[PDB]
Design a protein around this ligand. Structure first.
Ligand code: FMN
Ligand code: FMN
Ligand code: FMN
Ligand code: FMN
Lengths: 365, 365, 365, 365
């Protein structure tokens, strides 16, 4: 299944080893101003966005919109887009690429499809993230039209947890750290990983909120029993390579509380304590949507790992070269994009809820 | 969305306060013997978790299969079923019917649809769970045809964690406890909650394994990038009311490991470890599928509560009659049913993976 | 696939030979008053309502709504319903339940699923049509809210065609004849069929229009390239048992015209002609939607027919008893219901087309 | 909706005015040899059958496969492809491009999305058709693996009907004529159209048949009640620009016949006739699948037509230059491609029909 979403549907060209990757976003309402600045910046953030960098022009990826846009506005038809990349021949980063690399999908792909494909280029992921982030930017454009914003950051790296949260600080942080007081410790954990040719796990925090201060998000986003808002958020997040757990609000701490301790209350607007994480009974309750995504440490490490080959014979896996020491960092940005895509889809699906909605659109126009 | 699944599709009649709830399971291959005993037992286990400790009643819900079955075998057409329940004459065990109880979707439903609905009967959920378990039994029947089995149990209640897991023991446990050494402490936690008219959270462990002792599950279950096995398991589980987090394999503990520690190595025939939880790259890798589901404490408890009504005014929540002290217990069984439904859907979808599959079915027959 | 529709989704219990058939319609907006009189009348019309009848009460099938309705208004959740058919004794009408009846689904079901299972009792159709007409009544309630009405009638029987169309006259006609001038000839063809223990084909005309005189239907109903309005109308109609052809507007006669003769010109108020049949570019153009559905003659006829049994041996098929001499008559009503369902689905899907629809509903209502 | 299909899913970039169009075919089983010659010839045929042509690798066409293929074999992942066109310097044909061309989608797109975009390049048409024909080539590759072939030809042009059908002859005919004895007269109709700056309609005949030694197609293709084979063929064909009617088998002639005249009898050797057109009860019965598609005359004609502009001001539409005099000709090839896509999808969906299928792939593995 290469499509994400129900009304707002993102479909991808899938995994490939070519110089061009593509995707198409179907379901965008017409009349949405295309924010090229946003699209470009999203693509920049996807690349870790550290301290020093060169003009992305002659550097990396560029998003080419092939359809769905006219004079800088969405037309309402499918928005197709391509992303070109790859330059300069590499080395190897792997000897006989005929074995199953630990924690990689090589093993499952081989058995499900039987074809000995697999090649370099950051393998499975990486490419897809580009498509997801590009698509996420359009979803963000849609959400802004109704005052909704999505943000994220890193709350934990190698077990070093953030105590306070500053999303603005995460933005200009080399590791998107939300706690400047824990940032250095987190960075040191990363440096040690690179030093020992290893990798560490991390936890990303994603949030959705109304742009207006103390203004609540729409109440009721989520569709029926099998398309609940938290269920779809979990689906998108868990579907991200490297993700092994997803929490909503209080999450795993919820199982440790008593009703008297937990149990939220109301008044006339939106709840106070956000233990629900913005989702109650499968639907948005108006509070900020809080999501925690747990990433396992990066699979590829410059160390000798025992494994087997396509024939089944025991062999050694030694992946030379530099590798991402913590995928949670780049993963946080992708999770942010996915939340935008899910939320935008729900905003559109919700338009069908009350007959008054139909009357206002059809009988008053 | 009242349908779960892609090929094996479960559709529900949705929330209903009448005497009958219906559902239909579409996509069952023909020729599967209908295990009435299994279905009956599953429905029995569903109740286990409230007023049914060693000597559980049975004078409840009767399942009527209205189609899709002929001579005790699936015909290949939709299996429609009706579940008849309820009895006696409602007295108390509740309060006003013009208020959205504390931490209830009743609030969200009003904003989404704007209708003064709702009543008693455990608000809902419990009803849909009957549909899920019934459908789950059929899914289990299909899975058995290819040697797959799904099991579950309680690994944690009120922060009291199980150390060793015995699914055999959980079956005959009043609280489905997987660890007999921690069972008494877990029960006491519930006892105190009941005595205090409170409630506590819990964690269910669900797993799938190949029936044949020392056998592997099919490798490659999971579809494309947007219908990965872990993503779909997460979608189903998080969609259960009360669930705030879902873990696969090492789960939330994965973000605290290093690559050298996490990576599952391979020997001669199989992986040396299963931190992946049976899912690698979004596809089953043959090892046991491990899922952890976290339930927050039950909202409605005898203890007086507060929140809001339908007009954002004031009201009382003195809900007479006892209330479920731990939804995780009955929730574990539903999670087991959902895993069966997801896996069975995936088993059907995987038949399309290799051309040799089509040739075998069309040309070698 | 037991579900019809994208958002307004009708799911059926499928084929069965029990005393109860069910279905569920999801996607209905909340706040729609349930017109019970309309529902009852639709069920009455489905029976081909001919000369002389009695109170539909104790006579035949009655629709039981089990969910989705509160205080005579849709709740926005799934509307599940059950229909009860025969009960008091029976008669005969059968033969050798081991052979494939010519022009019946017997052969294909046998090969696709294998399981024999084939008796009498209207085999299929009759039941499913009931589910479609009941569901269609709800769709008609939705359409009425935005001023749209669907109607139908018989324009041909045995090649005897109508010249003028009077839908009011069709409602009171024993054969739903649209042209009273050809009605007697059409009725005679039917009488000859009965006399000769044979059947005859027919053609139904289905139309959708605005209830307010000459006002245009919404323009733009239909979705993207692969869910066009004429495409979905064709899918729904051709899917009806006995249908061999579907035409939109000028239909088959379109291929006989020159561009100058076919092209519908326009003036400020709208189109000057409607050869397009209300659908242009796969979307409603505001004019009346015109559909023609061609039915093959009824399969069951009381005449010896050469066929084979499940063992492959030649045998005689002789279906004793009376049979529907012209399925197009009852079919016309089902087609009317199907058009209502497709259009209502399209009315809901169209809500996401323009950003101003979202802004109006979220930033202002 | 920019996706066609349930499992073998074709998603398109949608309408665009750029020099690049794209699509992705998801669901292809792995291990299918990519027939580049087939793909290339298919792209050739979609442009017509002129006796005088220029060698490929130039002018147009050329499908760039970006993913889903490895060493000329399908990988089982999505097959994304791109099609390029347009260069420098052209003819002309353009004047006041802000009005609604009669019989074109201009009017509905404007009302549905409110954005004017209808530019040149034939508006699109050929654009989408290139995506469908390309995708159809892959579908044909799949189908060939189990002995299924799809063929097509023109049976009527401007009212001139073919009496005999020779598909081999259609392949080499300039207008894909199935009856060489009527071809000259059919060409004359087109000639007269061009001369008069007009256009004419036509009818395409599409057929699917088995090349297997039993000469029979698989029996049982088609899914449940709402995804029947004839329903999906009708959906695909009617969704094609210019199509106003679709017939299966005896089609519109079916309604003029009596049951005794229509019913397809059987004997030891199988069906004695095929008025059903190879689809019975919504499923393939093994006989050849017969489809007739009726096209309205080409919308664009070099003649004065009264219409209005996007603002409502009445004006004259005069489309200068030459135009396709009969879109039915190129349309026939697209119809062939669409039948292949639908059949291939059905071939995959049918794999879940019998439990014996699952057992053979999972237990005998
Ligand atoms: C008496 C009672 C029984 C419940 N039964 C179940 C159950 O069997 N399974 C489950 O997952 N949740 C169950 N719930 C949870 C409700 O479906 C619902 O989640 C809750 O009332 C609202 O809290 P939440 O929407 O924040 O989860 C139950 C709750 C109560 C109060
Ligand atoms: C060098 C390298 C780069 C990676 N890039 C990303 C990335 O950008 N985003 C992401 O979410 N995961 C990324 N991953 C994670 C892998 O896609 C994933 O861990 C692996 O293929 C399968 O993990 P799973 O079995 O848990 O699904 C990367 C892994 C490696 C080794
Ligand atoms: C006695 C009789 C009654 C029928 N009733 C209906 C009906 O009410 N509506 C309908 O659309 N088809 C009706 N049919 C049509 C059959 O369901 C259908 O022809 C058959 O199962 C499959 O043929 P098909 O390939 O044309 O669908 C009826 C057929 C017979 C023989
Ligand atoms: C110059 C011209 C070329 C066309 N080319 C094709 C073609 O190659 N294949 C096709 O199926 N339709 C083709 N069409 C049909 C149009 O896409 C279509 O008839 C019309 O613009 C939209 O109205 P309709 O979709 O309701 O028929 C063509 C039309 C014109 C005017």
């Amino acid at each position: 299944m290469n499509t994400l979403g129900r009304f707002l549907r993102l479909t991808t060209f899938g995994e490939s080893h070519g110089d061009v990757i593509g995707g198409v976003l179907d379901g965008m309402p017409s009349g949405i101003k295309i924010d090229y600045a946003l699209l470009e910046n999203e693509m920049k953030r996807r690349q870790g966005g550290r301290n020093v960098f060169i003009t992305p022009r002659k550097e990396d990826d560029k998003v080419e919109i092939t359809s769905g846009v006219f004079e800088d506005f969405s037309t309402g038809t499918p928005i197709g887009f391509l992303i070109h990349n790859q330059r300069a021949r590499s080395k190897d980063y792997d000897n006989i690429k005929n074995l199953f690399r630990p924690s990689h999908a090589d093993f499952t792909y081989f058995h499900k499809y039987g074809i000995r494909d697999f090649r370099g280029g950051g393998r499975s992921s990486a490419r897809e993230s580009a498509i997801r982030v590009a698509a996420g930017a359009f979803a963000k454009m849609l959400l802004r039209e109704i005052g909704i914003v999505c943000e994220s950051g890193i709350i934990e790296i190698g077990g070093i947890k953030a105590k306070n949260y500053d999303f603005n600080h995460a933005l200009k942080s080399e590791i998107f750290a939300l706690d400047e007081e824990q940032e250095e410790a987190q960075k040191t954990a990363i440096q040690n990983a690179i030093k020992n040719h290893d990798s560490i796990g991390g936890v990303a925090l994603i949030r959705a909120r109304s742009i207006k201060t103390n203004q609540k998000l729409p109440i009721g986003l989520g569709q029926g029993l099998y398309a609940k808002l938290d269920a779809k958020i979990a689906e998108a997040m868990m579907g991200l390579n490297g993700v092994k757990a997803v929490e909503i609000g209080k999450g795993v701490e919820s199982s440790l509380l008593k009703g008297s301790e937990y149990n939220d209350l109301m008044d006339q607007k939106g709840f106070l304590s956000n233990r629900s994480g913005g989702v109650l009974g499968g639907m948005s309750n108006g509070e900020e949507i809080i999501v925690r995504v747990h990433f396992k440490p990066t699979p590829s490490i410059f160390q000798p790992q025992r494994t087997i080959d396509i024939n089944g014979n025991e062999c050694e896996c030694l992946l030379k070269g530099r590798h991402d020491p913590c995928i949670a960092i780049r993963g946080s940005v992708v999770c942010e994009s996915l939340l935008a895509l899910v939320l935008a889809d729900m905003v559109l699906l919700n338009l069908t809820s009350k007959i008054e909605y139909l009357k206002t659109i059809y009988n008053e126009n």
